[PDB]
A paper describes a structure:
Because hydrophobic groups in the sugar anomeric position have been shown to enhance the affinity of galactosides to LecA,[3b, 14] acetyl-protected 4-carboxyphenyl β-galactoside (GalA) was attached to the peptide dendrimer. Similarly, the structure of the GalAG0–LecA complex shows the phenyl group in the hydrophobic groove adjacent to the carbohydrate binding site and the “face-to-edge” interaction with the C(ɛ)–H group of His50. Binding of the tripeptide portion of GalAG0 to LecA causes an average 0.66 Å inward movement of the phenyl linker relative to the position of the nitrophenyl moiety of NPG. This movement triggers concomitant inward movements of the interacting Glu49-His50-Pro51 loop of 0.45 Å on LecA. Overall, tighter surface interactions between LecA and GalAG0 are observed relative to NPG. However, an intermolecular T-stack of an aromatic ring with the C(ɛ)–H group of the histidine imidazole side chain at a distance of 2.5 Å is unprecedented. This interaction probably contributes favorably to the binding of the phenyl galactoside to the lectin. The strongest binding was observed with the second-generation glycopeptide dendrimer GalAG2. This dendrimer contains an aromatic aglycone linker that engages in an unprecedented T-stack interaction with His50 at the LecA galactose binding site, as evidenced by X-ray crystallography.
Author numbering: 1 to 121
The structure:
């Protein structure tokens, strides 16, 4: 399993040790407070009131936790995933990323502590 932090200001994303393979079932639990600029802090679900103006993931609110599996598109993680299975032809290292607009990560603060584990299958 993997346990670590994902800094909101980390545009490249946090690479984990989790290699998602075909047929894998995974569980992710994320917690913490982070910001995409404002003094206020939000959770892994981001800011439900903030409009999407170029986010790396259009399927989640700004300030939410997302991930990539291999060289796939951004996938919503939010508070986490319970016994989750990836789409077909999706595989590779899991990279956790703070959902924000490309090139704006500079003024982000906080982070998310995240737990990733593979489930029995
Ligand atoms: C509108 O209510 C509003 C717009 C922007 C904002 O902060 C910026 O949000 C950007 C993402 O949309 C980007 O992350 C900037 O760096 C932030 O300063 C708050 C509220
Ligand atoms: Ca920002």
């Amino acid at each position: 399993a993997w346990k670590g932090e994902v800094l909101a200001n980390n545009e490249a994303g946090q690479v984990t040790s989790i290699i998602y393979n075909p047929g894998d079932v995974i569980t992710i639990v994320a917690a913490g407070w982070a910001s995409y600029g404002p003094t206020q802090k939000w959770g892994p679900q981001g800011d439900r009131e903030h409009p999407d103006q170029g986010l790396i993931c259009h399927d989640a609110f700004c300030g939410a936790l997302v991930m990539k599996i291999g060289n796939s598109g951004t996938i919503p993680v939010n508070t986490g995933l319970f016994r989750w299975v990836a789409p077909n032809n999706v595989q590779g290292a899991i990279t956790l990323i703070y959902n924000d607009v490309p090139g704006t990560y500079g003024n982000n603060s906080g982070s998310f502590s995240v737990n990733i584990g593979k489930d029995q299958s």
